[PDB]
Amino acid sequence: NSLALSLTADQMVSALLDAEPPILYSEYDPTASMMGLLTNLADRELVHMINWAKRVPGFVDLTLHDQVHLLECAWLEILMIGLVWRSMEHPGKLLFAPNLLLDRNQGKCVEGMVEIFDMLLATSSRFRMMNLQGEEFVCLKSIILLNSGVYKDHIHRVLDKITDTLIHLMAKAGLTLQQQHQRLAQLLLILSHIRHMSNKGMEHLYSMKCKNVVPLSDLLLEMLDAHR
Amino acid sequence: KRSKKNSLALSLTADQMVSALLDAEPPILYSEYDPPFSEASMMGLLTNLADRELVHMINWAKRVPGFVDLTLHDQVHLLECAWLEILMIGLVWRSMEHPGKLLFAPNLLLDRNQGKCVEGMVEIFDMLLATSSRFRMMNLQGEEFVCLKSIILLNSGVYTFSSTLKSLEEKDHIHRVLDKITDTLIHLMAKAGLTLQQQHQRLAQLLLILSHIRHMSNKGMEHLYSMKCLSDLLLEMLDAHR
Numbered sequence: 001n002s003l004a005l006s007l008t009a010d011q012m013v014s015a016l017l018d019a020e021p022p023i024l025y026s027e028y029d030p031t032a033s034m035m036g037l038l039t040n041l042a043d044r045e046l047v048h049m050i051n052w053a054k055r056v057p058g059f060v061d062l063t064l065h066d067q068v069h070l071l072e073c074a075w076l077e078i079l080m081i082g083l084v085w086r087s088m089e090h091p092g093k094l095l096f097a098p099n100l101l102l103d104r105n106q107g108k109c110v111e112g113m114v115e116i117f118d119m120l121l122a123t124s125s126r127f128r129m130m131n132l133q134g135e136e137f138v139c140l141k142s143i144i145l146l147n148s149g150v151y152k153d154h155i156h157r158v159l160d161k162i163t164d165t166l167i168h169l170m171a172k173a174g175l176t177l178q179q180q181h182q183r184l185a186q187l188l189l190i191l192s193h194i195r196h197m198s199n200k201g202m203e204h205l206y207s208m209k210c211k212n213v214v215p216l217s218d219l220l221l222e223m224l225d226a227h228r
Numbered sequence: 229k230r231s232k233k234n235s236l237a238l239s240l241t242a243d244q245m246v247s248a249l250l251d252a253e254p255p256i257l258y259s260e261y262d263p264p265f266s267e268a269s270m271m272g273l274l275t276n277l278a279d280r281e282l283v284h285m286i287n288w289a290k291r292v293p294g295f296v297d298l299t300l301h302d303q304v305h306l307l308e309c310a311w312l313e314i315l316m317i318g319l320v321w322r323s324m325e326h327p328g329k330l331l332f333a334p335n336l337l338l339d340r341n342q343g344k345c346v347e348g349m350v351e352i353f354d355m356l357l358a359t360s361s362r363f364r365m366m367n368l369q370g371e372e373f374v375c376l377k378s379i380i381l382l383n384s385g386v387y388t389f390s391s392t393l394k395s396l397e398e399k400d401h402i403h404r405v406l407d408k409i410t411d412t413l414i415h416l417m418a419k420a421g422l423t424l425q426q427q428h429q430r431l432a433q434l435l436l437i438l439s440h441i442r443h444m445s446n447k448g449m450e451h452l453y454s455m456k457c458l459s460d461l462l463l464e465m466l467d468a469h470r
C-alpha cells in the first residue's frame with residue numbers, strides 16, 4: 001500500500017523540488033488597494049497549492065476529505081513559509097511576488113498588519129541567519145501540510161521519513177551529530193512561530209472580510225471559513 | 229553563574245539540567261471547589277485555577293536555567309507570550325493516565341460531556357484530549373516534559389522582543405540555552421536505548437506537537453477574550469495578546 005516509505009532520501013528531496021509550484025508575478029502597475037494584490041496572489045497561489053499538495057508523497061494515499069482537511073488547516077502556513085523563504089535574501093522586505101516588495105513602512109498601509117508583517121520579517125531574518133537551504137525548505141513545508149491538521153498513523157510514518165531526510169541533508173552537509181539534532185530542533189521550533197502567524201493572519205483577514213472593500217476570492221473565503 | 233556570557237544553563241551537564249528542571253517544578257494545585265456544575269460555576273473554577281497557576285508560573289520561570297540572565301522586561305515578555313501554552317502542556321501531561329478526561333486539578337477532573345457546560349469550549353477540549361492521547365501513545369516521560377515546557381517558555385516569544393546590539397545578545401542567549409535543552413532531550417533518548425534515527429524522529433515528533441500546543445493556545449486565547457465581559461493578572465496576560 002504505502003509506497004511513500006520506500007522512497008530514497010535523495011528521491012524524497014528530488015520529488016519535493018520538482019513538485020514545487022510555478023513562480024507567480026503580480027500583474028499590476030504601481031501608482032491604491034494594497035489589500036487587493038496580496039489577497040489576489042494568495043488566491044492565485046492557493047490553486048497551485050492544491051495541485052502541489054497532490055504531488056507531496058503520501059498525500060494522495062488517503063481520503064479526499066482528509067486531503068481537504070490538511071489543506072484547509074495549513075493553507076496559510078504554507079503561504080507564509082513560502083513567503084518567508086522567498087524573502088530571505090531581501091533583508092527588511094517581503095517578496096510576495098518579484099514585482100512586490102513592501103518593506104515595513106511601505107508595507108504599512110493596512111491597519112492591523114503592522115505586527116504580522118514584522119513577524120514574517122523576523123521569521124525571514126531567522127531563516128537568513130541559519131542559511132536555510134531549498135531542500136530543507138521543501139521538507140519543512142511538507143511537514144507543515146502533514147502535521148497541521150492530523151489531530152493518522154500513515155501521516156506520521158511519512159513525517160518520520162522527512163525527519164530522516166532532513167537529518168540526511170545535515171549529515172551530508174558535514175554537520176556533527178550534535179549540530180544535526182540542534183539544527184533539527186531550531187527549524188521545527190520555527191514552525192511553531194509560523195503556526196502562531198497563521199492563526200493571527202486568519203483573525204486579521206476575518207475582521208477585514210466582514211467589510212465592503214475589497215472583494216475576497218471565493219477560494220480565499222472558502223479556505224478562511226474552514227477555520228470558523 | 230552571573231552573565232549571559234557564562235550562563236548556568238550552559239555550564240550544567242545533561243543530567244544536572246534535568247535535575248534543575250525537575251526540582252524547579254511548581255507545586256500541584258488543588259481546586260477550591262465543593263462538588264454540581266453550572267455554566268458560570270465551571271467558568272469560575274478554571275479561571276480561578278489558571279490565575280493561581282499563573283502566580284506560581286512566574287516563580288517557576290525564574291528557576292529555569294538561563295531565564296534570569298534575560299532582562300526583567302524580556303522575562304515578562306516570554307511569560308506573557310507562552311503563559312497559556314505552559315498551562316496547557318501541563319494539563320495534557322497530567323491527563324495522560326486519564327483517557328477521555330482532563331485533570332485540571334486532583335479534585336477537578338472533567339470529561340468531554342462536562343466541557344459542553346461552557347459554550348464554545350468543546351472545540352478546545354477535544355484538541356487538548358487528542359494531544360494528551362498523543363503524549364500517551366508516545367509514553368512521554370517527566371524528564372522530557374519539563375524540557376518541552378522550558379522550550380515553550382524560551383521559544384514562544386523569542387522573536388517578539390529594539391534592533392540594538394544588546395537585544396541581539398538576548399536573542400543569541402535564548403538560542404544557546406535552547407540548543408542546550410535540545411542536547412538534553414537527545415541525551416534522554418540515547419539513555420532509553422533509542423537509536424540515532426529514533427533519536428531524531430522522536431525529537432521531531434515532540435517539537436511538532438508544540439506547534440499544536442501553540443495552535444490551541446491561540447484558540448484558547450481568542451475564546452477567553454470573547455468570554456470576558458477573570459483576575460487582573462489573567463487579564464494582564466490576555467491583553468498582552470491584543
Ligand SMILES: C[C@]12CC[C@@H]3c4ccc(O)cc4CC[C@H]3[C@@H]1CC[C@@H]2Nc1ccccc1
Nearest residue numbers: 271274277278315316319352448451452455
Ligand atoms: C482558558 C481556558 C480556562 C483555563 C484553562 C486551564 C486552566 C488551568 C490549567 O492548568 C490549564 C488550563 C488549560 C486550558 C485552559 C482553558 C482553555 C479554554 C478555557 N477558556 C475559558 C474562558 C472563559 C471561562 C472559562 C474558560
